[PDB]
């Protein structure tokens, strides 16, 4: 009993603190405001809701040796929430894989600034779907001194719908996505990184230049780097002929054109004007260039490194739970030691504390936002 209490309090504390720190960090920091991180916030919410609505009465139950002394309707409420929040977590890991696959497979360019908010819409769908899976639990599925899902048909249904069916689908999509990105990565990575650096560095030289000569020299180096980068063809388009190739180079053509206009200004000694033109180059790079540079240099694939770790931890933490529960539901005679049933439940809930740690260790932006304690 004391161990359930101690472990339980620590668990609830860790989930609340870790996941709130994630939510607030995506809130405070512009560098964490990305499409992927919308889902990460959603997952954090699921874990916060778990710590607030489910874990306390779960811990209380465990201190009372598994006994349930409260009403059966409250039990039904708790179990529906339990099922929904577990399902929401999984469906959101699924949604990330669907979102990232579409981002990689379907390059889009918008006229208007900003995102489409399609991630928000997908996240909303994810939660409604999870509620749909969980909804029958609220209507009362049990035949009573314990709080368990006794309906064997329902348990098989949800085990399949919430876990054994989405997990293979999500693993296939993550795999296609990573393979998809690899195809965009140029062989001569270091050369393109050099070009990218020459661009970003000299933009900074231009901002703090003392005179027109320095601005002109920097612009000249940018021009050279832009033209070099324009020749770095990803393997995806290497088998293409001079359509697709028109899209790729066109961005660099706009950039060089703007650099040329800026050079004329710098050459005439119009430093202020040349500097303002260099700032408009920053926006062009963001529009037609920067997203594709990060893809073709291998940076976007690198930034996705944290996702397999999150998925891996989830599978590690929840696979025993679902194997135990579907086995029981399929085969009453397949007697699982109550002690093990309890163990795999704790392991499932411990996952809700792990993700903040995983981000901090395995994702650069979260890690850097952390490291400035
Ligand atoms: C997403 N699919 C499921 C999820 C479940 O729990 C997360 C369960 C489940 O059986 N949960 C039981 C029911 C109650 N829960 C522990 C608990 C929570 C709150 C108060 C007391 C006990 C247990 C882990 C079953 C399914 Cl099919
Ligand atoms: C059951 C625990 C271990 C299973 C973890 C599952 C990992 C989910 C992600 C799968 C996609 C492949 C990820 C492998 C590293 C990236 C590959 C690459 O860079 O091309
Ligand atoms: C790729 C499959 C991952 C399987 C699930 C991983 C579970 C996550 C648990 C956290 C362990 C953290 C310790 C790792 C330290 C090494 C980090 C590093 O080398 O960069
Ligand atoms: C600001 C990041 C959002 C998450 C906040 C942190 C949540 C709890 C994590 C802290 C536990 C730290 C465990 C040690 C790993 C960090 C070490 C490192 O930075 O490399
Ligand atoms: C961060 C700390 C949270 C991680 C610790 C959680 C696991 C505690 C497990 C305690 C075992 C409870 C025994 C159950 C019982 O006796 O009925
Ligand atoms: C009850 C259901 C609770 C639903 C919680 C869902 C909200 C998470 C979605 C919010 C998106 C975060 C945006 C941050 C970002 O831009 O990266
Ligand atoms: C979003 C991710 C979904 C991943 C695929 C998993 C399948 C879950 C299907 C849920 C269907 C249950 C609906 C219940 C009903 O209307 O009767
Ligand atoms: C699970 C849901 C899977 C959704 C995947 C659909 C992506 C279809 C990809 C079509 C690529 C368009 C780009 C093109 O062909 O020119
Ligand atoms: C996606 C993660 C990996 C999944 C692991 C494999 C899942 C296996 C789960 C089901 C095994 C339970 C079946 C045992 C009783 C079956 C009754 C019978 O044989 O008639
Ligand atoms: C990595 C973190 C590892 C997580 C370990 C948590 C699970 C251990 C729970 C021990 C089993 C106690 C419940 C059995 C019982 O008393 O009924």
Distance in angstroms (rounded) separating the CA atoms of residues 163 and 150:
19
Distance in angstroms (rounded) separating the CA atoms of residues 310 and 47:
13
Q: Is the CB of 346 under 6 A from ligand 10?
A: yes
Cα 357 to ligand 3 centroid, rounded to whole Å: 10
**CA neighbor of 36 nearest in space, from 310, 297, 281, 241:** 310
Helix (H, G, I), strand (E, B) or coil at 184: coil
Cα 309 to ligand 3 centroid, rounded to whole Å: 6
CB atoms under 10 Å from CB of 223, counted, come to 18
Distance in angstroms (rounded) separating the CA atoms of residues 90 and 71:
29
Cα 320 to ligand 9 centroid, rounded to whole Å: 11
Distance in angstroms (rounded) separating the CA atoms of residues 95 and 193:
31
Kindly report the protein residue whose alpha carbon is nearest to atom 17 of ligand 4.
Answer: 361
Tokens of 241: 């002929």
Query: Could you tell me the domains of the chain?
Result: 2-108+116-139+150-184+300-371 (1.20.1070.10), 189-297 (1.20.120.10)
Distance in angstroms (rounded) separating the CA atoms of residues 85 and 53:
10
Q: Any idea which ligand is nearest the CA of 351?
A: 10
Angle in degrees, CA 291, 293, 298, rounded to 5: 105
Tokens of 321: 């739970």
Distance in angstroms (rounded) separating the CA atoms of residues 13 and 7:
10
Beta bridge partners of residue 221, listed in sequence order: none
Quick one: CA dihedral 198, 199, 200, 201, positive or negative? positive
How distant, in Å, are the alpha carbons of 26, 175, 236, 371 from that of 307? 16, 11, 24, 20
Q: Is the CB of 33 under 6 A from ligand 6?
A: yes
Distance in angstroms (rounded) separating the CA atoms of residues 73 and 138:
8
Quick one: CA dihedral 134, 137, 138, 139, positive or negative? positive
How distant, in Å, are the alpha carbons of 204, 276, 290, 329 from that of 334? 68, 74, 57, 9
Those residues whose C-beta lies under 8 Å from the C-beta of residue 127, and which sit 6 or more positions away, are 42, 88, 91
Distance in angstroms (rounded) separating the CA atoms of residues 299 and 235:
16
Tell me whether residue 318 is exposed, middle or buried, using C-beta atoms within 10 angstroms of its C-beta: 0 to 12, 13 to 18, 19 or more.
buried
Probe ligand 4: pick from 16, 353, 357, max atoms within 8 Å of CB? 357
Cα 19 to ligand 4 centroid, rounded to whole Å: 11
Q: Which long-range contacts (CB under 8 A, 24 or more apart) does 254-263 make?
A: 254/284, 254/288, 255/226, 255/281, 255/284, 255/285, 255/288, 255/289, 256/223, 256/226, 256/227, 256/230, 258/284, 259/219, 259/222, 259/223, 259/226, 260/223, 262/215, 262/219, 263/216, 263/219, 263/220, 263/223
Distance in angstroms (rounded) separating the CA atoms of residues 345 and 158:
16
Query: Phi and psi dihedrals of 44, rounded to 5?
Result: -65, -40
In contact, 189 and 248? CB cutoff 8 Å: no
Q: What is the DSSP letter of 66?
A: T
Cα 133 to ligand 6 centroid, rounded to whole Å: 20
DSSP 146-171: B-----HHHHHHHHIIIIITHHHHHH
**CA neighbor of 91 nearest in space, from 122, 114, 51:** 122
Distance in angstroms (rounded) separating the CA atoms of residues 65 and 59:
10
Q: Give the E-state strand segments of the chain in sequence order.
A: none
Distance in angstroms (rounded) separating the CA atoms of residues 196 and 232:
12
In contact, 367 and 337? CB cutoff 8 Å: no
Q: Which atom of ligand 1 is nearest to the CA of 326?
A: 27
Probe ligand 4: pick from 22, 310, 363, 370, max atoms within 8 Å of CB? 370
Distance in angstroms (rounded) separating the CA atoms of residues 245 and 97:
28
Quick one: angle between helices 306-330 and 152-159, nearest 10?
A: 160
Cα 347 to ligand 10 centroid, rounded to whole Å: 6
In contact, 102 and 74? CB cutoff 8 Å: no
Query: Phi and psi dihedrals of 67, rounded to 5?
Result: -70, 150
Kindly report the protein residue whose alpha carbon is nearest to atom 16 of ligand 6.
Answer: 33
Q: Give the residue carrying structure tokens 């465990």.
A: 62
In contact, 40 and 311? CB cutoff 8 Å: no
Question: What is the CB-side half-sphere exposure of residue 265 using CA atoms within 13 A?
Answer: 19
CB atoms under 10 Å from CB of 45, counted, come to 19
Distance in angstroms (rounded) separating the CA atoms of residues 289 and 287:
6
Q: What is the DSSP letter of 67?
A: B
In contact, 98 and 174? CB cutoff 8 Å: no
Those residues whose C-beta lies under 8 Å from the C-beta of residue 260, and which sit 6 or more positions away, are 223
**For the chain, how big is the Rg over CA atoms in Å?**
26
Query: Phi and psi dihedrals of 146, rounded to 5?
Result: -140, 160
Tokens of 306: 């944290």
Q: Any idea which ligand is nearest the CA of 352?
A: 5
Q: Which atom of ligand 7 is nearest to the CA of 135?
A: 14
Method by which the model was determined: X-ray
Cα 318 to ligand 10 centroid, rounded to whole Å: 13
Cα 151 to ligand 5 centroid, rounded to whole Å: 27
Q: Is the CB of 342 under 6 A from ligand 10?
A: yes
Angle in degrees, CA 279, 282, 288, rounded to 5: 145
């Amino acid at each position: 009993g004391a161990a359930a209490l101690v472990g339980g309090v620590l668990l609830i504390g860790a989930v609340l603190a870790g996941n709130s720190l994630v939510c607030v960090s995506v809130a405070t920091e512009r560098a964490l405001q990305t499409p992927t991180n919308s889902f990460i916030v959603s997952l954090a919410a699921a874990d916060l809701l778990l710590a607030l609505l489910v874990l306390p009465l779960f811990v209380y139950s465990e201190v009372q040796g598994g006994a349930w002394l409260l009403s059966p309707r409250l039990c039904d409420a708790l179990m529906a929430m339990d099922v929904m929040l577990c399902t929401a977590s999984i469906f959101n890991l699924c949604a990330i894989s669907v979102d990232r696959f579409v981002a990689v497979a379907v390059p889009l360019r918008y006229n208007r600034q900003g995102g489409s908010r399609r991630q928000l819409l997908l996240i909303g769908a994810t939660w409604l779907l999870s509620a749909a899976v969980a909804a029958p639990v609220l209507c009362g599925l049990n035949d009573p001194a314990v709080c368990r899902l006794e309906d064997r048909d329902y348990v098989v249904y949800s085990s399949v719908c919430s876990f054994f069916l989405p997990c293979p689908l999500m693993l296939l999509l993550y795999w296609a996505t990573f393979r998809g990105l690899q195809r965009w990565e140029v062989a001569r990575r270091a050369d393109l990184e050099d070009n990218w650096e020459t661009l970003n560095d000299n933009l900074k030289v231009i901002e703090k230049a003392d005179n027109a000569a320095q601005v002109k020299d920097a612009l000249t180096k940018m021009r050279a780097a832009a033209l070099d980068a324009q020749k770095a063809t990803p393997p995806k388009l290497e088998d293409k002929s001079p359509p697709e190739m028109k899209d790729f180079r066109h961005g660099f053509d706009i950039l060089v054109g703007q650099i040329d206009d800026a050079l004329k200004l710098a050459n005439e000694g119009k430093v202020k004007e040349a500097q303002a033109a260099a700032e408009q180059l920053k926006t062009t790079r963001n529009a037609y260039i920067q997203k594709y540079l990060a893809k073709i240099t291998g940076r976007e694939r690198k930034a996705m490194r944290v996702l397999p770790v999150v998925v891996g931890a989830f599978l590690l933490c929840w696979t025993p739970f679902f194997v135990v529960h579907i086995t029981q539901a399929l085969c009453p005679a397949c007697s699982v030691p109550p002690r093990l049933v309890s163990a795999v439940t704790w392991l499932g809930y411990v996952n809700s504390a792990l993700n903040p740690v995983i981000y901090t260790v395995f994702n650069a932006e979260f890690r850097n936002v952390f490291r400035k304690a």
